[PDB]
Design a protein around this nucleic acid. Structure first.
Ligand SMILES: [K+]
Ligand SMILES: [K+]
Ligand SMILES: [K+]
Ligand SMILES: [K+]
Ligand SMILES: [K+]
Ligand SMILES: [Mg+2]
Ligand SMILES: [Mg+2]
Ligand SMILES: [Mg+2]
Ligand SMILES: [Mg+2]
Ligand SMILES: [Mg+2]
Ligand SMILES: [Mg+2]
Ligand SMILES: [Mg+2]
Ligand SMILES: [Mg+2]
Ligand SMILES: [Mg+2]
Ligand SMILES: [Mg+2]
Ligand SMILES: [Mg+2]
Ligand SMILES: [Mg+2]
Ligand SMILES: [Mg+2]
Ligand SMILES: [Mg+2]
Ligand SMILES: [Mg+2]
Ligand SMILES: [Mg+2]
Ligand SMILES: [Mg+2]
Ligand SMILES: [Mg+2]
Ligand SMILES: [Mg+2]
Ligand SMILES: [Mg+2]
Ligand SMILES: [Mg+2]
Ligand SMILES: [Mg+2]
Ligand SMILES: [Mg+2]
Lengths: 132, 565, 49, 171, 327, 118, 101, 50
RNA sequence: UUUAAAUGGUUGUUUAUAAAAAAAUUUACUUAAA
RNA sequence: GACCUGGCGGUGCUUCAUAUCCCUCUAGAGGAGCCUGUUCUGUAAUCGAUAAACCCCGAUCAACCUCACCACCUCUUGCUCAGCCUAUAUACCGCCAUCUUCAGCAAACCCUGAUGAAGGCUACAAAGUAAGCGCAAGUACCCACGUAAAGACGUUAGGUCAAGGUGUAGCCCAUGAGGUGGCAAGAAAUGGGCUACAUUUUCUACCCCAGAAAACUACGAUAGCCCUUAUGAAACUUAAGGGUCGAAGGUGGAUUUAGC
């Protein structure tokens, strides 16, 4: 049996998001890519360095906003810009969000030497696609 | 593209949970974001190693770590220059002393640069990331000690010392040093003369005529030394002339007329100082009226550039005078000037921007048609500023004057969205206006829904933690609004609140409760109306009871009513 | 540069700005092993000699 | 390496070993069955080992109407914060160690004669708060399936009554 | 009392869309429809659903292969599943006399058809397909079994067999759908004229990776040029030349047309097959309709779909497996 | 807690007029914000007897590179402002043959636009 | 803080090889021709052989940057097949999907 | 802007590669990935530098 | 009705409850004086 | 003693299997040489897989490196707020094999068996209603075909502590780290593959109308030996080419693989 990225059936009580409900054979059929850059296009360079950066950013944001992220990040690269789109919860105070956005945008811009923006979208609770 | 009126300023996160919902949150949300940026910068400069891998092409110098520590450890004049460039007041002074003790030669230019650093900062370390009243100049300061040590003292050395003393409120000491400067037959620069003008006015408390003579004498010294005045020379004169409220008006105009003749173009700061001088607490404002009208005619359609540090204070002062004169056409001219080209950037800090727009919108509501007032309301709020609770009251008053009370429910919704849910003054004004007169059924229903919402706010007050207060007018108004809309059930519950909170019901509330009972024809309810008013000993109750007894009253209830009194 | 990534994120954890769930997990395990007596011995002064 | 660290959910799923061959067919019975502890419970955002006070995160943004600047708790002050944190953990841990006194039935380890409480309210706003439930038997019955072999099921006999003549039982 | 851990809010929580909710969704669609027309700079009053789909496709470009996963802006009536209305009032009395069956709509229809048959008894095709099961369930807004569907069709068929009035025929046509039958008739290419006024037809042919373009002239001597070369020189293998003869021989027109064809890709046999198809299709312009049908029934006008199958991983070929070892 | 938990304001699409200047809402390329786009757009493969997911918290819409900043109205307004920067092609050089006669040499160069820090 | 001691040894080899690349190229050029005298080419043979062993580029190994796996690494991403698949199957590699045809 | 433009679609490029299914052994079982590169070519003509 | 076709070490393959809480910031310039 | 469920039966009846069980169709493997695994034996000198479901398997790959092995030498807060390819895959996550070339799994209820383990269908219908998961449907490739992909719950404590992470236990002047050198063989057996034994062939031209060859100078080595070249710092060894050499092999026992 295949295992890769398959949330397995429970008793019908496990809430899954839309991304977590779709196995890898749906990645260009029902769900899209969580990162969009040019590295993996034919004749394009630096796929390796883009990959390491994405892995770091997903770890950085998970620990920088502990317990706030409601789904996976969407990383966007346009020219020199990097845009991180995160769906967060409405539990942490707004003052703490603004502090962390100013902190993460500055720290990451100096680390990867490029303008970085963080676009937060808040949800009251985790969006449940189905109960598995 | 133009400003989006539905959105808050671009600096904020465009999310309903994170968008600022009040004027205070507007300030604090930005301060929190700035704090985050400072914390990140503190880490970047604390651990440069982690941010030294440069992967950017072209290279971005601004995204590299900063090094603030001197990297030359040799004791020499060239190594000292570094500490002065780094603005290390204590390191530089200590090294200069060590250099002098060793006996090596320090150039006059290097010594002058050290004095500039010491004089500007008052021999105190500039603020760093991490490690008002009174005269900041101190007699036992490093600047004075080094100044005497200097073997050769040129004109610039004296100049920077005079400017330092005036900057730090050592006015008398600065004037004494200028006297020494003159004794040495050394010409002073424009900037020293500008500081000296301030010194003479602040130093002594003489009457205007004496101070004016002193200022004029410095200007004559300036001409004698072939020193050409700059814009700041005149702006300091006008700023200094603000203490003498009514004596400097004509002299101040002479200073302005002199500027134009010489060729120095008055900036926004120049006119700011003038209008502040001419606009003192006086009811006529006859002179102020002429000045502002003439100033606005001159400034019409002029694109400005930053010339004086006080250029940002003009618009708030201009709008404040327009509100005092209550001239809407003048206010539109002031705002017109703000909107031409890039003049909007001179509005100033946040508290300046809020004051300007508060005075501007308060004048619109008062002096303009309601249909245009509502357009300004939509364009300015929240995209330009977050309204004060008092500006919502002015808007409600404008709606009353215009007889457009169908908008009152919307104003309440907006007020709650702008952080005025629990403002007592605003809640009482809305209820009073809604209940002041009777309205058609549809408008009466809407007012009942708004009253029910205002009631929920009173119930859910956060002040409850301290104490919960139900004003008498608020309670009376809410009850009347429920009765007029036909929600008698809800109104009957309010009757308990009056006695609970010890609030006296108005006669109009009691007189109108009759019909509600008569339409129902329930004598029991009619007595309840009599019972309450009797508790408060209202004179209308006794006369009222007799009429109720005639209309609808049970025999057994009639006897009890009289004895209860 | 694994040295930079590891050292940066360790500094940010000690500063309170990064929560390392993994490091927290192995700090709790290492803490429970001290109460159980399975503590790392002193270097040089080990069981053997 | 920072890149080999996993999340808490992955670390606990491996360490607990709740899904494995050891649990499929009564294969491994361990009294020392490991329990999950949430290590983010008492943690505050912005609190670290160095004790820095970040305005607007760890500490209030404005104090005395002025924006606070970056500060660091003194050594002795940080020791108190760290000691208090240890005490809080021990107290929380203590609560879980405490055993609540269960009223025993016919025997200490028997299910017979233990109350199950009132029957659950019916969908149509129906209530049985007068009725009391008591277990009578709990049996581990077994059937054999082609795929899994022994399939364990629970058979429970319970009686219910209000104490005023109305009583019943069901399996 | 030992407290059984109580159930939370039902996790499944099957979503029901009440009629008020649908009404609010319709209001939202109408306002959004006006916003979308305003965004695209079109007239709000003539903005159709096909303009909405075009605008949404441009504004929210999605390449997801499955179209049901792409961003959609449709009328709530087309999005939300059709839901049966409340079947009883406040008093609790159901509204239908066949409610307690559980299939009031199905059994009410069954009752109606039986009644019509009784009255009919007392009184006395190719395009249309019987409504399928999934579509009948939609009409009735009820779940049916396969055997329930069969029973209904049997009555409907029985009703048609007996004589029927205007009313009964209309009722049946409610449950009959339209089948558009594709015609298996070859499309004839236009007869063009060259600079000299000679009539010719041009068609294309594909076989494996070979692609041919054939120009068949109405009148000729039987000369075939392949890529500018005489066909016997281009195709030295006899079998290949036999393939070029088959289209013309089958219609008894050997030596009556000239052909100038260009072929690329594939091997020797695929190229001869591609030319055979291109020539047969172009030759259809100069033969009778009946002859075109004979050509189609001889396999001369069908594109051969047999193409090389891909090799799979873990096998030797498309089908050939690796040697299996029992032990 | 002195108040209750901070309540999110209603989405600002409820204040937007149906005849607004949309280019002012999305002046530049920005991620899809459900509270700023006044369209009831849905996305996501529907579950059985279900509908595509709504736009709030919809990560599939967030993954799309939207063209909300490039509506036909905006592009036309943008190009009117950019006409000042353009210069006129020589009218004499009508055809390619005319270009070759007056300008015999042709230089080809290529520029590559990729995403990244370098 | 590298994944293991093996990765750390490869990091040092890549660094030493970089430092000596120019010297090795210059000496190797002297040897890779028939123009120069054989006596000179023999001295160059000894000189390049006396350079540190870890400067030899053939000793560098393309290990997975995340796990240090020395085999099964895809050069374009510098990732082992296992790590690559983990990122690809979660939709975190731009434009990489499961192939069916 | 008054520019003469013509658009065509160059043929797409699909790069495919194969990886092992399991972490250890089971060589017969593979996972096959691909990267699709689609093209569009805008051909402008008769422009000036500005 | 209808050829023959023996074997597979020992022991191991089933019961007691569930789950933290938090806290606020606290509405509208410029300026100056002694 | 009597039952329930499942398994099994050299158990009955009926209907079937579509590369499939038999008969049949085509090309192969088991014989020879060589290449490459494995087992045994050997070596101071890894490990793992190892009925079907191991055996060109982890490796889309080992001259040093890789490396985890052996010998010798060296280091001790050590690239790391250490480290360990040390034990346990019978503690696990992760990724999988297998039945599956399957169609079943199943919460929540209801009813039957006197309220036992358990069981629940008949359509001219007799107690079942069933969310969810899988199949299916959709999607990818050239179609609606085909092929991919997909394929639940479970079965074999199946595979993998040596991808990485990790529970438990163990080592900490050593079971850790580094340097130099070195082993990776064939008595024997065996799996898979390659090339052959030729005339539907061999060589050349050509790419399908040719001329020669055709049995001890034929067919037949990608082996042996010698030389050269390529890569590398390092090649008796790795690869390529040339020369020399011209062996077994003459269509293969029991048995056995694949294909619609
Ligand atoms: K035993
Ligand atoms: K049986
Ligand atoms: K054979
Ligand atoms: K073989
Ligand atoms: K372990
Ligand atoms: Mg498989
Ligand atoms: Mg006991
Ligand atoms: Mg084949
Ligand atoms: Mg190598
Ligand atoms: Mg025996
Ligand atoms: Mg046995
Ligand atoms: Mg053989
Ligand atoms: Mg082995
Ligand atoms: Mg083994
Ligand atoms: Mg070695
Ligand atoms: Mg080796
Ligand atoms: Mg070891
Ligand atoms: Mg196992
Ligand atoms: Mg198909
Ligand atoms: Mg398959
Ligand atoms: Mg399927
Ligand atoms: Mg095992
Ligand atoms: Mg094993
Ligand atoms: Mg060792
Ligand atoms: Mg041969
Ligand atoms: Mg040879
Ligand atoms: Mg060589
Ligand atoms: Mg020969």
């Amino acid at each position: 049996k295949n295992r890769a990225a398959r949330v397995r059936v429970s008793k019908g009580d496990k809430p899954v998001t839309y991304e977590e409900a779709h196995a890898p054979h749906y990645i260009a059929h029902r769900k899209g890519w969580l990162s969009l850059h040019t590295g993996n296009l034919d004749g394009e360079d630096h796929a390796a360095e883009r990959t390491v950066e994405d892995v770091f950013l997903r770890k950085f944001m998970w620990g920088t906003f502990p317990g706030c992220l409601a789904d996976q990040l969407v990383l966007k690269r346009r020219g020199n810009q990097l845009e991180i789109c995160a769906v967060v919860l409405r539990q942490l105070s707004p003052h703490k969000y603004y502090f962390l956005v100013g902190y993460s945008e500055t720290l990451l811009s100096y680390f990867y030497k490029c303008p970085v923006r963080l676009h937060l979208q808040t949800v009251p609770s985790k969006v449940v696609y189905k109960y598995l | 593209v133009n400003r989006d009126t539905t959105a808050v300023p671009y600096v904020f996160q465009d999310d309903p949970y994170l968008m600022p919902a009040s004027s205070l949150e507007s300030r604090s949300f930005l301060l929190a974001k700035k704090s985050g940026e400072n914390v990140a910068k503190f880490i970047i400069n604390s651990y440069p190693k982690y941010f030294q891998k440069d992967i950017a092409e072209p290279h971005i110098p601004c995204l590299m770590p900063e090094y603030f520590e001197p990297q030359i450890k040799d004791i020499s004049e060239a190594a000292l220059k570094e500490r002065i460039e780094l603005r290390k007041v204590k390191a530089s002074v200590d090294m200069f002393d060590q250099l002098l003790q060793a006996g090596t030669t320090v150039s006059l230019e290097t010594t002058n640069s050290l004095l500039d650093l010491l004089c500007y900062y008052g021999d105190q370390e500039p603020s760093t990331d991490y490690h008002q009243f009174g005269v900041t100049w101190r007699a036992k300061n490093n600047a004075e000690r080094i100044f005497s040590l200097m073997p050769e003292k040129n004109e610039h050395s004296y100049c920077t010392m005079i400017r330092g003393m005036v900057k730090h409120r050592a006015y008398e000491q600065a004037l004494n040093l200028y006297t020494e400067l003159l004794n040495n037959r050394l010409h002073a620069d424009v900037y020293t003369f500008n500081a000296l003008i301030e010194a003479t006015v602040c130093a002594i408390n003489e009457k205007f005529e004496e101070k004016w003579s002193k200022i004029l004498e410095l200007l004559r010294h300036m001409v004698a030394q072939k020193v050409k005045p700059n814009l700041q020379t005149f702006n300091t004169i006008l700023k200094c002339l603000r203490r003498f409220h009514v004596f400097a008006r004509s002299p101040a105009l002479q200073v302005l007329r002199e500027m134009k003749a010489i060729g120095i173009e008055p900036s926004l700061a120049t006119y700011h100082h003038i209008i502040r001088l001419f606009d003192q607490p006086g009811d006529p404002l006859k002179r102020s009226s002429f000045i502002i009208y003439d100033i606005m005619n001159e400034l019409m359609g002029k694109r400005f550039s930053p010339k004086d540090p006080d250029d940002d204070k003009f618009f708030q002062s201009a709008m404040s005078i327009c509100s005092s004169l209550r001239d809407l056409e003048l206010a539109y001219q002031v705002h017109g000037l703000l909107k031409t080209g890039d003049n909007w950037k001179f509005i100033g800090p946040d508290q300046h921007r809020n004051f300007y727009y508060s005075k501007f919108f308060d004048l619109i509501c008062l002096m303009e048609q309601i249909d245009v007032t509502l357009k300004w309301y939509e364009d300015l709020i929240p995209s330009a500023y977050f309204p004060h609770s008092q500006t919502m009251i002015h808007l409600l008053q404008a709606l009353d004057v215009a007889n457009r009370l169908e908008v009152i429910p919307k104003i309440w919704k907006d007020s709650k969205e702008y952080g005025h849910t629990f403002r007592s003054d605003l809640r009482e004004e809305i209820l009073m206006l809604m209940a002041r007169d009777k309205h058609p059924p549809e408008l009466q229903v809407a007012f009942a829904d708004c009253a029910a919402d205002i009631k929920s706010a009173y119930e859910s007050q956060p002040i409850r933690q301290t104490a919960q207060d139900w004003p008498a007018t608020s309670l009376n108004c809410i009850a009347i609004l429920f009765l007029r809309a036909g929600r008698t059930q809800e109104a009957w519950k309010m009757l308990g609140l009056f006695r609970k909170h010890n609030k006296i019901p108005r006669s109009e509330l009691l007189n109108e409760l009759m019909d509600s009972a008569k339409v129902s024809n329930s004598p029991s309810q009619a007595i309840e109306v009599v019972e309450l008013a009797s508790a408060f000993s209202l004179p209308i109750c006794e006369g009222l009871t007799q009429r109720v007894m005639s209309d609808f009253a049970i025999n057994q209830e009639q006897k009890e009513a009289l004895s209860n009194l | 540069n694994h040295h930079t990534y590891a050292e940066l994120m360790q500094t940010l954890r000690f500063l309170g700005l990064y929560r390392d769930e993994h490091q927290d997990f192995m700090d709790e395990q290492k803490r429970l092993k001290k109460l159980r007596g399975k503590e790392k011995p002193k270097k040089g002064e080990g069981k053997r000699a | 390496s920072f890149f080999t660290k996993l999340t808490a959910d992955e670390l606990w799923k491996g360490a607990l070993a709740e899904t494995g061959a050891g649990a499929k067919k009564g294969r491994g019975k361990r009294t020392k069955k490991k329990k999950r502890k949430d290590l983010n419970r008492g943690q505050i955002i912005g609190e670290g080992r160095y004790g820095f006070l970040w305005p607007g995160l760890n500490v209030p943004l404005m104090k005395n109407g002025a924006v606070q600047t970056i500060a660091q708790r003194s050594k002795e002050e940080q020791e108190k914060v760290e000691a208090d944190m240890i005490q809080q953990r021990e107290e929380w841990d203590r609560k879980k160690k405490m055993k609540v006194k269960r009223e025993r039935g016919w025997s200490g380890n028997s299910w017979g004669g233990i109350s199950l409480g009132p029957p659950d309210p019916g969908p149509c706003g129906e209530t049985y708060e007068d009725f009391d439930t008591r277990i009578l038997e709990v049996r581990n019955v077994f059937t054999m399936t082609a795929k899994e072999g022994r399939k364990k099921s629970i058979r429970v006999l319970v009686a219910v009554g209000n104490g005023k003549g109305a009583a019943g039982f069901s399996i | 009392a030992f407290v059984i851990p109580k159930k939370n809010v039902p996790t499944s929580k099957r979503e029901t869309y009440t009629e008020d909710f649908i009404k609010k969704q319709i209001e939202e669609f109408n306002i959004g429809k006006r916003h979308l027309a305003n965004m695209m700079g079109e007239d709000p009053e003539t903005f159709t659903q096909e303009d909405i789909d075009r605008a949404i496709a441009y504004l929210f470009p999605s390449g997801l292969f499955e179209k049901r996963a792409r961003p959609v802006m449709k009328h709530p009536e087309q999005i939300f599943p059709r839901q049966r209305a409340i079947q009883w009032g406040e008093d609790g009395r159901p509204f239908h006399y066949l409610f307690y069956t559980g299939k009031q709509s199905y059994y009410s229809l069954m009752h109606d058809v039986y009644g019509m048959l009784l009255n009919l008894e007392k009184h006395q095709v190719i395009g249309s397909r019987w409504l399928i099961k999934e579509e009948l369930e939609e009409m009735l807004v009820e779940k049916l079994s396969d055997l329930d569907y069969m029973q209904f069709i049997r009555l409907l068929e029985k009703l048609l067999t007996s004589q029927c009035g205007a009313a009964e025929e209309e009722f049946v046509q409610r449950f009959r759908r339209s089948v558009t039958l594709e015609s298996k008739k070859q499309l004839i290419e236009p007869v063009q004229y060259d600079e000299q006024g000679m009539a010719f037809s041009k068609s294309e042919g594909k076989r494996k990776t070979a692609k041919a373009e054939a120009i068949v002239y109405k009148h000729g001597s039987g000369r075939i040029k392949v890529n500018g070369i005489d066909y016997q020189l281009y195709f030295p293998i006899t079998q290949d030349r036999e393939q070029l003869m088959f289209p013309f021989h089958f219609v008894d027109r050997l030596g009556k047309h000239d052909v100038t064809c260009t072929v690329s890709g594939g091997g020797r046999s695929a190229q001869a097959g591609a030319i055979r198809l291109a020539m047969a299709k172009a030759l259809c312009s100069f033969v009778t309709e009946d002859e075109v049908e004979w050509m189609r029934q001889a396999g001369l006008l069908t594109t051969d779909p047999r193409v090389r199958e891909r090799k799979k991983p873990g096998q030797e070929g498309a089908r050939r497996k690796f040697t299996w070892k029992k032990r | 807690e002195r108040p209750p938990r901070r309540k999110a304001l209603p989405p600002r699409t409820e204040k937007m007029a149906v005849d607004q200047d949309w280019p002012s809402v999305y002046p530049v390329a920005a991620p899809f914000k459900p509270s700023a786009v006044p369209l009831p757009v849905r996305m996501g493969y529907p579950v059985k007897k279900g509908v595509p997911m709504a736009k709030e918290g919809n990560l599939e819409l967030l993954k799309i590179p939207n063209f909300l900043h490039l509506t036909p109205v905006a592009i036309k307004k943008h190009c009117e402002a950019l006409k000042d920067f353009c210069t006129e092609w020589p009218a004499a050089l009508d055809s390619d043959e005319k270009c070759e006669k007056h300008f015999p040499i042709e230089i080809d160069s290529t520029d590559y636009v990729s995403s990244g820090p370098s | 803080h590298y994944v293991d001691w093996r990765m750390w040894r490869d990091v040092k080899r890549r660094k030493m090889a970089y430092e000596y690349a120019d010297e090795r190229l210059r000496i190797n050029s002297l040897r890779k021709n028939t123009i120069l005298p054989k006596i000179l080419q023999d001295v160059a043979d000894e000189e390049i052989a006396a350079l540190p062993r870890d400067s030899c580029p053939v000793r560098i190994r393309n290990r997975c940057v995340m796990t240090s796996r020395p085999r099964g690494v895809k050069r374009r991403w510098r990732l082992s097949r296992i790590v690559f698949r983990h990122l690809a199957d979660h939709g975190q590699l731009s434009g990489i999907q499961r192939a069916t045809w | 802007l008054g520019i003469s433009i013509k658009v065509h679609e160059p043929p797409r490029k699909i790069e495919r590669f194969t990886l092992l299914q399991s972490v250890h052994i089971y060589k017969k079982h593979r996972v096959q990935y691909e990267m699709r590169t689609l093209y569009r070519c805008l051909e402008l003509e008769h422009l000036t530098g500005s």
